[PDB]
Amino acid sequence: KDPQEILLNEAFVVPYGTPLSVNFGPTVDGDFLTDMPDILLELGQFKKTQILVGVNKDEGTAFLVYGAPGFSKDNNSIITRKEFQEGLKIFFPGVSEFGKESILFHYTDWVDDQRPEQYREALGDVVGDYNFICPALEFTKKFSEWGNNAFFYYFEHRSSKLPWPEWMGVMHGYEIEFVFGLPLERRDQYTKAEEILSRSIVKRWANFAKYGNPQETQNNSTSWPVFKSTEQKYLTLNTESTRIMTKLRAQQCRFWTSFFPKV
Amino acid sequence: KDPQEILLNEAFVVPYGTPLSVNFGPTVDGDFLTDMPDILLELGQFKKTQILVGVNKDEGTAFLVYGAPGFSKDNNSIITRKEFQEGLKIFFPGVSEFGKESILFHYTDWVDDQRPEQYREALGDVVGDYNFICPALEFTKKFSEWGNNAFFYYFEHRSSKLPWPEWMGVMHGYEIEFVFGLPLERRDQYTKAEEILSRSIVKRWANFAKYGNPQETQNNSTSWPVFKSTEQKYLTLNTESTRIMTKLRAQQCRFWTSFFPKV
Amino acid sequence: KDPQEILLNEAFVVPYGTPLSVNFGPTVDGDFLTDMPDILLELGQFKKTQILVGVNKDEGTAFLVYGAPGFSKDNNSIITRKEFQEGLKIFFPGVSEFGKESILFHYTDWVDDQRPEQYREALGDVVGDYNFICPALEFTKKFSEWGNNAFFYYFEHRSSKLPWPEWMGVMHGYEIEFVFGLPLERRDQYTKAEEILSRSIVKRWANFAKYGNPQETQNNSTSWPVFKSTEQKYLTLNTESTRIMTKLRAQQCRFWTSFFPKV
Ligand SMILES: *[C@@H]1O[C@H](CO[C@H]2O[C@@H](C)[C@@H](O)[C@@H](O)[C@@H]2O)[C@@H](O[C@@H]2O[C@H](CO)[C@@H](O)[C@H](O)[C@H]2NC(C)=O)[C@H](O)[C@H]1NC(C)=O
Ligand SMILES: *[C@@H]1O[C@H](CO[C@H]2O[C@@H](C)[C@@H](O)[C@@H](O)[C@@H]2O)[C@@H](O[C@@H]2O[C@H](CO)[C@@H](O)[C@H](O)[C@H]2NC(C)=O)[C@H](O)[C@H]1NC(C)=O
Ligand SMILES: *[C@@H]1O[C@H](CO[C@H]2O[C@@H](C)[C@@H](O)[C@@H](O)[C@@H]2O)[C@@H](O[C@@H]2O[C@H](CO)[C@@H](O)[C@H](O)[C@H]2NC(C)=O)[C@H](O)[C@H]1NC(C)=O
Ligand SMILES: *[C@@H]1O[C@H](CO)[C@@H](O)[C@H](O)[C@H]1NC(C)=O
Ligand SMILES: *[C@@H]1O[C@H](CO)[C@@H](O)[C@H](O)[C@H]1NC(C)=O
Ligand SMILES: *[C@@H]1O[C@H](CO)[C@@H](O)[C@H](O)[C@H]1NC(C)=O
Ligand SMILES: [Cl-]
Ligand SMILES: [Cl-]
Ligand SMILES: [Cl-]
Ligand SMILES: [Cl-]
Ligand SMILES: [Cl-]
Ligand SMILES: [Cl-]
Ligand SMILES: [Cl-]
Ligand SMILES: [Cl-]
Ligand SMILES: [Cl-]
Ligand SMILES: [K+]
Ligand SMILES: [K+]
Ligand SMILES: [K+]
Ligand SMILES: [K+]
Ligand SMILES: [K+]
Ligand SMILES: [K+]
Q1: Sequence-distant (≥ 6) Cβ neighbours of residue C96 within 8 angstroms
Q2: How many contacts (CB atoms, under 8 Å) link A and B?
Q3: Which ligand is nearest to the CA of A87?
Q4: Residue B259 contacts C where some CB pair is shorter than 8 Å
Q5: How much of chain B is in helix, strand and coil states, percent to nearest 5?
Q6: How far is the CA of C20 from the centre of ligand 14 (A)?
Q7: Quick check: helix, strand or coil at residue C14?
Q8: For residue B159, which of B137, B186, B177 has the smallest C-alpha distance?
Q9: Which of B71, B72, B84, B89 for mutating ligand 2's site (highest number of atoms within 8 Å of CB)?
Q10: What are phi and psi for residue B233, nearest 5 degrees?
Q11: Under the phi-then-psi rule, with left for phi > 0, alpha for psi from -120 to 50, and beta for the rest, what region is C123?
Q12: Which residue in C201, C184, C251, C213 sits closest to C51, CA to CA?
């Protein structure tokens, strides 16, 4: 077959896709991957070395405009309860009714004003916590239980040049340009504070690669503590103040990690 | 003398007052107070029991409009470096030039954009950290070193009905109405979220008085951990999310507590 | 160029030198030195082995007669406050006025008699603590935090044959002849007690090189304890009594190490 014909048909090999559909991805091949990876991770079979792991504040939002009803990059995407329910259908196509109600339940006990943005925000969190944040935090706990140093960050700066709308917040993919040092180029219309954040991140990544320890040691910076099961400290990355915090998304991940998999 | 004549002359018994002038306050009388209290605190001579201690996010701002030049409750109070320097004169009347430059130094290493509000914000912090926040945190460390449980909070909600302007933030005195439960009165034009914050605070204060432990135990609330020297955990009080944080104002209080007193 | 012409011009490559001017010294070349060394030290990138580190009691004095006003090797160098201030100019040429006042402040709170030698002594200490003693003690703490044994000494014997005057005390460079065993030569007009001190030092250095442990094990000598962050024990070297002491120059080094670098 010519390549186009393979590509054109890729989208349909699946009965129903989601916006995060991975039609063709990694498998347990007996070669690159000798067993189910959940089992390797659990039983400590992996390279012993240091890791640096992190997530952005609004991982799930990018995906809502590729299919969830009531969403648009061109308006404020205030959605109703019903639209929320329909969005869960779109993101959780093979899940029992009870599976879906349980998500609705975990994410809609409002605190508390009847804010119009309640449902729009809950859907972004749902998508981001299940698909990105809770699996990242779970890999870091399990990896670190076998003795190696790990460091965990939570990126909460929204690029001043972001072409997406405000409601989508600190989006998935939009730390990359900080890590690669784009805002160090003064000609580029990023702010002074963005220049400084990128410089500090670039230093911490570089020190991690060279020395295994993602510190910025010269400019009175906050020390990045190791992530240990038990305390679960992480470092926030932002323009205002860098903070040491504990137990990211603790209630949400208990839901995704210990209950949802049974469903 | 008639009372008016005593009152009229109270303001002048002092060569130069500040907006926080306490012309007539507590003294070491040999009776109520048997020694200099700094010495009692240091050497562990005080009632052994539990304490609950806290501060508001912008303690110092209320005072800037009673004398600092360039300030007004009726505009945004953008001040220059020079006006800052003059404000230090107003707040630190008996202090050497070097004493004042040292404050300027600690508080004006900008991060970093040349934001117009830099000087206005630094002056509020200066006034609040010296007069309220660092002495509160220091009393709590010293008290807790002798064995008793202590709990520390940082109140960061600005009342929706605050008649003062926005720049003044979470002002000194404006937690009181939350503690006394004014926003529980639905007729009063506070928001739903304010109602819930006040209800939770009132419960925590009440449980502290009855049981010595300022927990809200029924509504999946964040546990308030004891404040210990070493970890120095505190609880944030706000409408969005309640957090456990460590070492409030650590760099600023090291300045006020260990250096400024020598000056 | 002929060598003389390079040498003649070396002194002027610098806008203003101090008596400790190092016009041409080590650099981060990418070769011998792969990164800024403060960063290597902080992050534990160095040979892991034992170290022996120390300083003399009056490191800074030798330098005062190469430029500080009011100093002379031929008189008692009683200087005034003003001369002190001028000496700080000579030793701290690129430092802000505030930087200089802060030194004056740390070093001139007299205890307390108005002794005429107050200013002369404070200037020697200033020069010695900043340039030699606090950096030595800081390298030893940081080195030892990564697990290796370290030993720290404070040499306080003034050679009986010292051609410099008395006020200059236990000068920089004048332990060397003890380490190399010059006073073991009985023909040389050093005292009996100096002979014994040199013999003990030579033994301790030799045992350190051979065995990693700078003990003198045969003559009922004081054991030299390892220097650990936390306790910070050191050994004094003198003719009368050898002592174990803690936290050399603790108040002065807190000044040089944690505050002065910001200035
Ligand atoms: C925000 O936009 C969405 C997205 O759909 C629309 O895109 C808009 C920018 C709009 O101008 C229109 O061209 C396009 O249909 C709106 O969702 C749509 O809602 C309308 C109701 O009139 C329905 O016809 C559609 O079913 C629905 N489309 C999808 C894909 O869900 C949404 O109402 C709007 N919300 C606002 C302004 O809050
Ligand atoms: C904000 O207001 C201050 C306060 O002083 C003024 O109050 C204003 C609301 C104003 O309308 C006027 O009635 C009153 O004087 C301003 O500070 C003043 O600045 C002016 C410069 O024109 C000086 O004349 C005064 O010295 C000074 N007063 C004091 C007490 O400091 C300030 O300039 C203004 N700032 C803004 C708009 O950013
Ligand atoms: C100690 O000596 C200094 C050094 O300067 C002088 O050296 C002396 C030994 C002296 O005999 C003279 O030959 C030479 O000038 C004295 O400092 C000098 O003070 C004089 C005041 O008469 C000034 O003329 C100089 O500015 C100053 N020189 C320098 C280089 O600073 C100092 O007064 C003297 N102190 C004593 C005796 O306590
Ligand atoms: C450290 O120093 C200055 C700010 O005072 C700045 O130019 C530089 O970017 C900082 N370095 C890092 C790695 O953040
Ligand atoms: C607990 O329960 C409900 C919210 O579900 C609320 O009415 C009440 O105020 C809460 N109680 C406290 C003490 O916060
Ligand atoms: C030990 O013994 C004698 C003194 O009793 C002396 O001659 C010798 O120098 C001492 N040795 C050392 C290494 O100090
Ligand atoms: Cl329903
Ligand atoms: Cl490790
Ligand atoms: Cl915690
Ligand atoms: Cl200035
Ligand atoms: Cl108790
Ligand atoms: Cl911490
Ligand atoms: Cl003076
Ligand atoms: Cl060792
Ligand atoms: Cl001690
Ligand atoms: K968040
Ligand atoms: K459930
Ligand atoms: K704050
Ligand atoms: K200072
Ligand atoms: K000494
Ligand atoms: K200082």
Answers
A1: C263
A2: 25
A3: 1
A4: yes
A5: 45, 10, 50
A6: 35
A7: coil
A8: B177
A9: B72
A10: -75, 145
A11: alpha
A12: C213
The identity of residue A87, as a single letter, is G
Does the active-site annotation cover C59? yes
Is residue A236 helix, strand or coil?
A: strand
Q: Ligand 4: which residues within 6 Å by Cβ?
A: A 199-200, 203, 216, 218-219
Report CA torsion sign: A75, A78, A81, A87: positive
Residues in chain B: 263
Dist CA B226 CA B215 (whole Å): 11
| Residue found under tokens 């008699």 | C113
CB under 8 Å to B175, separation ≥6 — which residues?
A: B54, B56, B155, B237
CA distance linking residue A36 with residue A181, whole number of Å: 37
Cα–Cα nearest to B26, from B40, B16, B5, B12: B40
Ligand 6 pocket, residues with Cβ under 6 angstroms = C 199-200, 203, 216, 218-219
Determine if residue B172 is labeled as part of a ligand binding site. yes
Give residues with Cβ within 8 angstroms of A136, minimum separation 6.
A53, A54, A55, A152
Q: How many CB atoms lie within 10 A of CB B258?
A: 10
- State how far the Cα of C172 lies from the Cα of C174, in Å rounded to an integer: 6
Query: What strands, in cross-sheet order, belong to the sheet with A51-56?
Result: A51-56, A150-155, A233-237, A244-246
Measured distance CA(C226)–CA(C213) in Å, rounded: 9
C-alpha A156 – ligand 9 centre gap (Å): 20
| Among A62, A36, A94, CA closest to A172 | A62
Cβ contact B77:B64 at 8 Å: yes
Q: CB A215 to CB C43 under 8 A?
A: yes
**Closest residue of chain A to B247, computed from CA coordinates:** A244
Question: Would you list the DSSP string of C62-126?
Answer: GGGGGT-TT--TTS-----HHHHHHHHHHH-TT--HHHHHHHHHHH----SS--TTHHHHHHHHH
Of C163, C167, C168, the residue nearest C189 (C-alpha) = C163
Element containing residue A252 per DSSP (H, E): helix A250-254
Q: What does R_g of chain C's alpha carbons equal in angstroms?
A: 20
Residues B17 and B23 sit within 8 Å (Cβ to Cβ): yes
Distance of alpha carbon C169 from alpha carbon C124, whole angstroms: 10
DSSP result, A107-164: H----SS--TTHHHHHHHHHHHIIIIIHHHHHHHHHHHTTT--EEEEEE----TT--S
The C-alpha atoms of residue B127 and residue A1 are separated, in whole angstroms, by 75
| Contact yes or no for C39/C150 (Cβ under 8 A) | no
Which method was it determined by? X-ray
SS3 C16: coil
Residues in chain A: 263
Residue of B135, B140, B136, B137 lying closest to B50 (CA atoms):
B140
Angle, helices A118-128 vs A97-107, to 10°: value is 120
Resolution of the PDB structure in angstroms: 2.4
Which phi and psi (to 5°) does residue A259 adopt?
-110, -50
